């Protein structure tokens, strides 16, 4: 079969791209985002265990082994995934496709199908190797959609606008073709026979024709701009509105840059949905008419012009791929240079302290030299292309003039006819030139369409929910954690066997070391992610059987890393609550020590917070988050290390406000310092993905164990 090389869309999906390439080689094609989510790809890339798990899910029979340099000589299953260390710095996954005579062919998702000397490969190859093979159930499929038709369906509401552009272009082309005979009428008829009044009349007519052509171009340009802007808005809004509905496994498995960069893909798609189709429809007919007219003028000159355009197309097609390879290399080098510059500026204090202003300058100079070399390579490619195209164009023009003069001498045509042919050369060559130049745009548009539309197929948060029982309207009750396992994707499990019960309305404390997994349970209670095994029950009813809406309004969260949105204080304190009066906000500002702070701020609860509230310090934002959570009016309220950044007075006020909370509401306090929370109704100490002992402080101290040791060592 042909060697399939699925280029990676992101910087961390090289393993997913390799698995997709193997699947496509073996006859199974699907979206790269789906394979990316089954591989458990995260912001740090993919490990071999994820690839094995995803391959076994797909129907393969995967196995991860470590091989030596000699094992490459021994014949095994050729389509295997292998680890390489690019630049001896970064890990990478590639696809080995055949074992040849001291030459290794590998699909690198970042580069393409490349060849290496066995020495070079084995120098960069790590011992890691993954072997893939279809199992009993590997029904070949094509579970992907043509994303160009899906985004071209946005042209249906704007069929009138597209139709008007077509008619305007037809009239513009007709007027230009008619006006390209002025030079023929001059030399052959008016100048030769010395006609003055006819000269003036015909010249005025052609000026009027040109003015009409200009007006038509103006109108068509306005319409094209409007169409492009409408398509851009539609695609971007669709993508963003779908992204806001996707589950949380989507958001934390991707960088912010990866999610945001799909917004330029909307413009890339629009450049072909509107530009390419309109260009094809107009220029095909315009080129056909121009070629027919040129052949009417003279067959030999038309054949010469056809040869000219054929040579230009050949040259451009030949130079296409190297130019884009050079551009990709330039982009990579620029990204490396800007990352180095940002790192050097951000960590200036360390560099000054250690006296490293000399080697940092040398490293930046080396990176700038690399960028300059890549820029020179691309500039040389463009210069060679321009030189060849200019040679073709100029020699074609000279040859056309030469052959036209020869034909005029032989009497096959007149001088005016030759000049009219030279004029119509534009209306014949520009259409074909544009049609050939559509090639780079369509490939980029296809790649961008795949990138953007593979996300629009992902199931949203609501679509993955089990049927909701409508009889539950109150989350008040005991919170029971059965045998609950959890893991962020396909990494080491965080929670193992946490079985616990939280009574109705009683304050509960969870303590442990950093990285133990407390915030993990805090998010699992809020239906961010789901337990791998077991279930989470509230008042007997399972959480999954309750509507996702009722979970998010009746449960409030105060994370350790609070987030502030750019907006007024009232807007920040009421994010989803669209109907709240001022007095409730005022009261909520009381128990969170926010009224005193914001009163001293200029104006009142209307100040816009610039750059995610960069003006306020960490404690002030944490108090704001406390106030928002209290204003939410929850039945369960979780505080994940909320008071760590606060002072003594603020911590005391928060404590006596939370303890003296009205209504039968449950409070969960996740803390690292035991002395912060000691009077809680019950305390749960979980160390390795499971609780080892539960009880009050008077009960935990008496019973010798992990909690007693931690209390003795910390205090």
């Amino acid at each position: 079969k042909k060697y399939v090389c699925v280029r990676q869309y992101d910087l961390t999906d090289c393993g997913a791209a390799c698995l997709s390439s193997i699947a496509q080689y073996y006859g199974l094609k699907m979206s790269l985002a789906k394979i990316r989510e089954m591989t458990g790809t995260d912001t740090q890339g993919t490990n071999a265990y994820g690839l094995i798990h995803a391959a076994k899910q797909l129907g393969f029979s995967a196995k991860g082994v470590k091989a030596s340099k000699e094992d490459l000589l021994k014949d095994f299953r050729l389509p295997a995934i292998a680890n390489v260390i690019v630049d001896n710095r970064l890990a990478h996954f590639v696809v080995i496709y055949s074992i040849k005579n001291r030459i290794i062919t590998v699909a690198d998702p970042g580069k393409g199908i490349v060849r290496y000397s066995m020495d070079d490969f084995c120098s960069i190859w790590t011992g890691g190797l993954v072997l893939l093979e279809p199992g009993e159930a590997f029904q070949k499929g094509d579970y992907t959609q043509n994303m160009m038709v899906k985004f071209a369906g946005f042209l249906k509401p704007l069929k009138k606008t597209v139709l008007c552009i077509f008619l305007a272009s037809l009239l513009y082309t007709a007027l230009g073709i008619a006006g390209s005979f002025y030079i023929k009428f001059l030399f052959d008829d008016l100048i030769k026979f010395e006609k003055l009044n006819d000269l003036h009349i015909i010249s005025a007519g052609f000026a009027v024709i040109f003015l009409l052509q200009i007006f038509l171009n103006y109108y068509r340009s306005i319409l094209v701009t409007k169409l492009g802007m409408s398509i851009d808005k539609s695609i971007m809004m669709e993508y963003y509105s779908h992204v806001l509905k996707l589950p949380m496994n989507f958001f934390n498995s991707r960088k912010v840059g990866e999610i945001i960069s799909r917004f330029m893909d909307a413009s890339k798609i629009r450049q072909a949905i509107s530009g390419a189709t309109l260009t094809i429809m107009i220029d095909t007919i315009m080129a056909v008419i121009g070629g027919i007219l040129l052949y009417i003028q003279n067959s030999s000159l038309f054949f010469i012009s056809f040869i000219i355009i054929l040579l230009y197309g050949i040259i451009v097609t030949v130079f296409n791929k190297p130019i884009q390879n050079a551009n990709r290399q330039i982009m990579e080098d620029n990204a490396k240079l800007t990352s180095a510059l940002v790192e050097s500026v951000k960590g200036i204090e360390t560099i000054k302290s250690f006296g490293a202003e000399e080697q940092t300058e040398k490293s930046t100079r080396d990176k700038i030299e690399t960028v300059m070399k890549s820029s020179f390579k691309e500039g040389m490619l463009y210069i060679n292309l321009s030189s060849l195209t200019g040679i073709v164009a100029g020699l074609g023009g000279i040859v056309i003039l030469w052959a036209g003069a020869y034909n005029v001498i032989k009497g096959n045509m007149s001088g005016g006819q030759l000049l009219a042919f030279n004029a119509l050369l534009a209306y014949f060559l520009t259409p074909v030139k544009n049609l050939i130049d559509l090639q780079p745009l369509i490939q980029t548009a296809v790649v961008a369409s795949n990138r953007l539309g593979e996300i629009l197929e992902l199931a949203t948060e609501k679509e993955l929910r089990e049927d909701s029982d409508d009889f539950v309207i109150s989350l008040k009750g005991d919170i029971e954690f059965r045998n609950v396992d959890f893991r962020y994707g396909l990494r080491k499990p965080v929670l193992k066997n946490i079985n616990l019960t939280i009574p109705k309305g009683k304050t509960v404390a969870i303590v442990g070391e950093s990285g133990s997994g407390k915030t993990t349970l805090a998010k699992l209670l809020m239906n961010f992610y789901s337990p791998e095994k077991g279930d989470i029950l509230i008042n007997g009813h399972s959480i999954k059987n309750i509507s996702l809406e009722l979970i998010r309004k009746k449960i409030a969260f105060v994370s350790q890393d609070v987030f502030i949105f750019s907006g007024t204080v009232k807007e920040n304190l009421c994010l989803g609550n669209e109907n709240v009066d001022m007095d409730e906000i005022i009261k909520a500002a009381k128990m969170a020590n926010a009224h005193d702070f914001i009163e001293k701020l200029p104006l009142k609860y209307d100040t816009f917070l610039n750059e995610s509230g960069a003006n306020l310090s960490e404690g002030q934002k944490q108090r704001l988050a406390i106030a928002r959570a209290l204003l939410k009016k929850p039945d369960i309220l979780i505080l994940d290390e909320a008071t760590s950044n606060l002072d003594s007075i603020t911590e005391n006020h928060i404590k006596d406000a939370i303890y003296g909370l009205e209504d039968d509401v449950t409070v969960i306090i996740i803390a690292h310092r035991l002395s912060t929370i000691v009077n809680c109704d019950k305390i749960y100490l979980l160390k390795d993905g499971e609780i080892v002992e539960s009880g009050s402080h008077t009960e935990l101290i008496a019973l010798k164990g992990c909690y007693f040791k931690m209390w003795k060592q910390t205090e």
Partner: peptide
């Protein structure tokens, strides 16, 4: 065959970012 099979921990340790 053709190699030494890694266990699960070694598999997850084989980072390919």
């Amino acid at each position: 065959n053709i190699g030494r099979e890694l266990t699960d921990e070694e598999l997850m340790e084989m980072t390919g970012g």
